[PDB]
Structure formats: structure tokens, C-alpha cells
């Protein structure tokens, strides 16, 4: 019940919320159907429209007007945004040359530059260049302030997940808004765009910017706007709030436009109908900037122009139907569209089996436009598994396509030419970032970055301490003139042992053999130096990674590579090696095919054994430093050490061997040497975080050898590729992957073909940030470089997307 008989008199767009049954007058009262009776009349005036004209200048104040052109309007803070232009011979903000804002220029009583977030729905990244002719205001923001060529959204590239990621710095698996539509099995409740369940606070996790602000004593405008409130009124309300007394005035604000998303769904991302809504958005931006100018805040306020996701060409005819795949289609519930999520229709149905669903959805048609996944097999970069609201079964839909359950869902629900939601590395899904103001840099282009990073910056812009989030605080310091956050490297928790020769051959009973008894002060002194670390500066280029948890491990040195070997997991945590442009690939010689060698630096009790691989009919082994890249026939023996061995399914070895034999050398050729760090990942609970010892769900049969869920590699070289990777003076260039360690290649539909036709494609799908790997291993990389820490943080957040321009 709402007792709507109260009044909005002097409360229009009030900031504190009144709970039921008291009628409300805030910017969301319409969405709750709870506004006071006189809200429209008093708060939503439209008389005479939104622009001053010559004949209105100096008019007698008339309180019925939507905005004012009388002399008192400035003191009142309620002039039309073009008032001074029309009546006082002032210029529009867009017609002024831009002039660096070297220091904040704010009216007295402003404790800090205010932040205004101008969010635009479905604003595709390429609109900045392609629509630049009809967007003069936005183009000036872009060219004069700080801009990125694009900003990467989070998956799924839908509205609620991304707007709430913006606000919180969190992955949707953490903040809880994992789609526009959701079922939560613990609540037994559904979240929908349509209806009232979505206003329930239980859905919304983490701590969004407005709460972070309020709690730390910084007032916030309310971020959300009921749809029916026109854009002009949104803008006039922000402007009015900004003329409140110092004690009452908020320091952070949000505007939101439904455009250009709304039209992009109807007309496609580039439909000729799309010009108008881009023009209209620009006009709205111009209104705000003119309004700030009038208030003397245009060189005081930080403005963020930001979008939530892009828009792709999608039409009804490009739909795949689960009914052409499954016998049991009526036994499932599908969340449909640009992504698919599948659960049982009834929890009482015991003939439901994900295994059979997955298989009936796997590589069934030549042209198949979606790929099914158990959520834990989704690329780790998507960070989309650790929430009960995400269904075990997921369908990754090709750009341009939909998935539905049955044809009747599509014609009985073309009506549309655009949509979004696809994989967040897809070009058409990328979106915009522009920062403009005293705290942002001047005419500066920054590289593309992820929207999860903005919350930290918005907090920095407001002098707030961010709630714990998935951004890497400091990685966006290069966007900022001042207010930087100067982080320190985490402290190493475990220090390595450095074992020498401690065991005789006969002490080992591992069931391994190697043809190495084929036997000198010249080279023996030299090869002892190798074991002691004489080549370590070549292969360990950016210092040893730090171990950020409590564990027991050894550093092991070799001619061609260096490792940190876990006595707890019985295999390296990381293996590091450098491959120069000139390095040469060799084969594994015949007499060494099955060679595995005890490591006399490491006890039998802390070693793997070959017997367990003999007995485990499912499991084979690979090596982290590849024997194919040994610097000499003698050095090659090191690569067959039991301490370089890791468990690998035969199907995964097809992948790994092709990476080691062909691709590493290729990257070394193309990039002028590369430094490689490889190792295992254990994430059995799919939380994006390293598993402890008591969380391992699978061992090589009979043994305590744990089976990795993933293998990673970090491939670093010189950004200035005219310098070799091992003699690089300046910035670095990195690409990484986290490959799922799977017993089959079902994910790659072309895998019966030669590795050259499908392995690199898999690795690109599984591209990762160094940061992703850090979360999964508890290691901290790049600890000793000549680069500043913020630059290193930026590098650690970089993702190599292999998407074209
Ligand atoms: C992304 O950032 C968030 C925020 O730091 C990380 O989520 C947080 O992760 C930890 C460990 O899973 C959670 O700690 C747990 O808290 C509860 C008490 O609420 C307690 O029962 C547990 O014993 C544990 O201490 C924390 O709740 C969680 N917070 C949120 C807001 O989700 C997340 O791990 C980050 N993701 C990645 C991949 O780095
Ligand atoms: O008032 C807000 C958000 C303000 C805000 C500002 C800053 C925020 O955080 C930031 F400032 F940090 F960005 C967060 C929210 N909203 C967002 C809601 C989207 N919506 C749709 O009907 C809709 C739109 C596109 C679609 N495509 N497909 N289905 C779609 C459905 C209703 C809108 C009300
Ligand atoms: Ca884990
Ligand atoms: Ca296959
Ligand atoms: Zn959206
Ligand atoms: Zn949309």
C-alpha cells in the first residue's frame, strides 16, 4: 500500500528515500508506482519546453515553466541550459576551444571536484569514430580529455550485469547480477526486467559506488531514473542538485540514457535510423556542459562518458533451436538469446542428465552456431562460474546468432535487427570510455581496458577507499593527472629452499628408466655452474615470481630453464625459460622417448613416479620446459628430469606438444625472442582462485600426484621488437593463456584434423591476463624489472584478444 495523498510540494527529486506507505518524490517513485498525487504537476513540468528563446529573456518568473529565462534563474539554479547563450551573449561549451584544465577551478565551498557519470546504453565503441560528425559535444570530450579506443565490458554483455560491474568493480559471478533474467535456487525466486522481485536487495551483492560514497561521508545523487522522466529533466535535476548548499549538495551523480541501445535493437548497430539517436545523445551532453558552464563548473567537474556494452547485427532468421538437437526438449528450461543457460525443468525428474544434453549439443551440425560448455570449462577470462545463479550448462553463441528452445518461442512471443550479450572479447560488443576534467589527463589516449577497473578510479576521483573488488588498483593510474594510488608489491610469504645434490640414484624407486649412462674438468665445472644458477639471468628475466601463500618449495636451476618446484604438489608451480629468435627446434631422440630421470636434488618422497603413469590408463605425462628447445644434446637431459614432469591426458598432450614444438618457436621468430613462464593450475571449485591441498578432486591413480584443471603460459617480450627479449630497455609486451586440461578435445570440432588447423584457435579462445593467472596460482610475477609498478600493473591486466581492428 501507498498513501499517495501526501504532497511533493518542495520535495521534487528529494535525495533521501521515504519508505511505505508514505508517497515518494524521488527519481524512482514511478518505477514503484508510489509517487505523491502531485508529482507530475510539480516535479515533471514541461511548459514551454527546454530552451530559452530571445523573447523569454528577462521574463517575469512563472513557476509553471519547465525551466526559466528570468533574471533570478541563476540564483535559483533553474535556468534552461541554454539561458546564458540566448540571453547573455555567451557561447555554447562546444564552440569554445579546449584549454587544458591544469588545476581544478571550482566555486568557493566545493570541498572536492564533483564526479558526474554519463552512462549510455548500447554505445558501441566504433560509434566514437563512425558517428563523430554528428556528435560534436562528445567528440570534444573525447579529443580534449582522456579517452580509450574502446572499453571491454564483462560477460554476459547485457545491461544489468555491466552497469552493476561498473558500479562495484566486481565480476557478475561476485556481485550476483549474472544476467538480465535469473533464477536463484536457494531463494527459489526469479529476477526479471519486468516486475518487483528485482528491487529486492538480496539480489545485489558487493558495494556499489553510491553506498561506498555515503558510508565514507560523501553525498551521492540517486543513480537510477524512471524511464518516463525525459532526458532534459534528468539533466536539469543534476544541475539543480549542484546548486544546493554545500552541506546538502552531493559530490557524485549519474545520468543514464536508454539510447542508443533502444534504437540499435530495432535497426541494427549501423542502421540509417541510428543517426538521430546519436545526435540526440550529443545534444543531451551539450545541455549538461552548457549547464555546467552557467554554474561555473565546466572546469571543476570530472565527467565520465561511459557505455555498458556494444551492439551486433542479429535477426530472427539467425536462430539455432534446441529442438533440432534434443529428444527431451520439454524436460529443460532454457534462458535464451545471445547466450544460453540450461537447467532441468523439474527437480523431481531423475532421468535428467547434463552429460547426455551436453553430448547431444556437441559438434552436431557442420555450421553449428553455438558451443555448449559445463560452466567450469568456460574460458577462465570470462570469470563466469562461481555463482549458484549461473546454470551448470552454458551455450556460447556465435556473434550475430541466437539460441532458442523451439521455433514457436521466436515467432509466438522479424521484430529486431540488433542484439548483444555475446563473449566480451567480440569487437561489436566493445564499448566506450572518455574521462574529462581537472583530474583526468589532457588530450591523452590510453589503451583499451576492462570496465571492472573503473570503480577504483571513481573512488580515487572522490577520495574514497574502494570496497574489495576485481579491479587492480593502480593499473589505470595513467588515466589520471593527480589522485593516483601508489600501491606496494605484496610481500612474499614463502621463501624457497635452494637444494644441492642430496640423493644417490639407488635411493629412488620410481619405476622410471632412461638411456643416459652414455658417458672431464672442462665441461663438468661448467655444468655444475649451471645447476648453481649461472644462466639464471637469461631464463628468469623479471625476477623469481613471489609465492604469496604458505608452502614448501625448491628453486631448481638448469642450463636452459629455472623452476620453483612444489614438494606439496610434487611438480613445479612455475617453469621459466627464454627462447631467442635464433633458437632451434630439435626432436626427442629415439633413445630418450620414454626417458624420465630422478632429480638428485629432491627426495624420493617428494618426487613423482613413473609407475603411477603406467597404471593410470587415462593419464599420460608432459614436460613444462620442452625438450624440443634444448640448447644442446647434453642440456636436453635436464628436460627429462622427474621434477620437470606434469600429468597430462593424452588428448591434452596433442595440444601441449604442438604449443611446445611449433608455436613457441613461431612466437620467438615473430617477437624477437620470448620469455616463457609455464605451470599448472588447480581450480576444482571454479572460483578463479588457487585450490589448497585439501581441495584437489583428482590424482593420478594410486598416488598423491594431483591433476591440474588447467595449464597456463605467460609469454613476454620487448614492446620494441627491434630489441631481443633478453636485452629489452623499455616497456614489455605479453600474451598468456589458461588452457583447460581436458581428457578429450570435444571443444574443438575440427580436432581430428592436424594440430595446425585447430590448436592455436583453442589457445586464442583461452587467452588470459597475467592477473588471471595470479589469482589462480597465488604467484606474483614481474617483481624485478626496470619498469614503474603502475606500468607493470597495467601490463598484468592486459589481455591479448586476437580480434581485428
Ligand atoms: C573478486 O573480488 C571479490 C571481492 O574481494 C572476491 O570475492 C571475495 O572472495 C572471498 C573468497 O572467496 C570471500 O571471502 C569469504 O567471505 C565469507 C564471509 O562473507 C566467508 O564465509 C568466507 O570464509 C570467506 O572469507 C568474499 O566473501 C568475497 N566477496 C565478494 C563481495 O564476493 C573474489 O574472489 C574476486 N574474484 C577473483 C577471481 O579474484
Ligand atoms: O537507471 C538505470 C541505470 C542507471 C545507472 C547509472 C549508473 C550506474 O553505475 C555506474 F554509474 F557506475 F555506471 C548504474 C546504473 N536503469 C538501467 C536499466 C536498463 N533498463 C532497460 O529497460 C533495458 C535497457 C537496455 C536493454 N537491452 N536489452 N534489454 C534491455 C533493458 C531500465 C534501465 C534503468
Ligand atoms: Ca579454487
Ligand atoms: Ca573434437
Ligand atoms: Zn545495456
Ligand atoms: Zn539492449
PDB file of C-alpha atoms in Angstrom, residues 13 27 31 159 173 193 226 251 272 276 300 346 364 375 436 506 532 548 568 589 632 751 782:
ATOM      1  CA  UNK A  13      13.624  14.794  -6.640  1.00  0.00           C
ATOM      2  CA  UNK A  27      13.587   9.866  -9.350  1.00  0.00           C
ATOM      3  CA  UNK A  31       9.005   2.514 -11.101  1.00  0.00           C
ATOM      4  CA  UNK A 159      22.800  -4.280 -19.312  1.00  0.00           C
ATOM      5  CA  UNK A 173      29.708 -14.026 -10.521  1.00  0.00           C
ATOM      6  CA  UNK A 193      13.351  -6.887 -16.097  1.00  0.00           C
ATOM      7  CA  UNK A 226      12.428   6.046 -14.143  1.00  0.00           C
ATOM      8  CA  UNK A 251      29.562  15.057  -4.799  1.00  0.00           C
ATOM      9  CA  UNK A 272      20.449   4.621 -41.112  1.00  0.00           C
ATOM     10  CA  UNK A 276      19.093  10.586 -34.892  1.00  0.00           C
ATOM     11  CA  UNK A 300      35.676  21.900 -11.908  1.00  0.00           C
ATOM     12  CA  UNK A 346      11.648 -30.173 -12.848  1.00  0.00           C
ATOM     13  CA  UNK A 364      26.282 -31.948 -34.309  1.00  0.00           C
ATOM     14  CA  UNK A 375      30.320 -23.690 -16.887  1.00  0.00           C
ATOM     15  CA  UNK A 436      37.271  14.774 -18.965  1.00  0.00           C
ATOM     16  CA  UNK A 506      69.745 -46.034  -5.904  1.00  0.00           C
ATOM     17  CA  UNK A 532      74.093 -23.317  -9.231  1.00  0.00           C
ATOM     18  CA  UNK A 548      52.031 -15.357  -1.724  1.00  0.00           C
ATOM     19  CA  UNK A 568      53.434 -30.246  -1.687  1.00  0.00           C
ATOM     20  CA  UNK A 589      65.969 -38.570 -29.883  1.00  0.00           C
ATOM     21  CA  UNK A 632      72.357 -28.790 -26.867  1.00  0.00           C
ATOM     22  CA  UNK A 751      40.347 -31.738 -33.750  1.00  0.00           C
ATOM     23  CA  UNK A 782      57.297  -9.324 -12.795  1.00  0.00           C
TER      24      UNK A 782
END
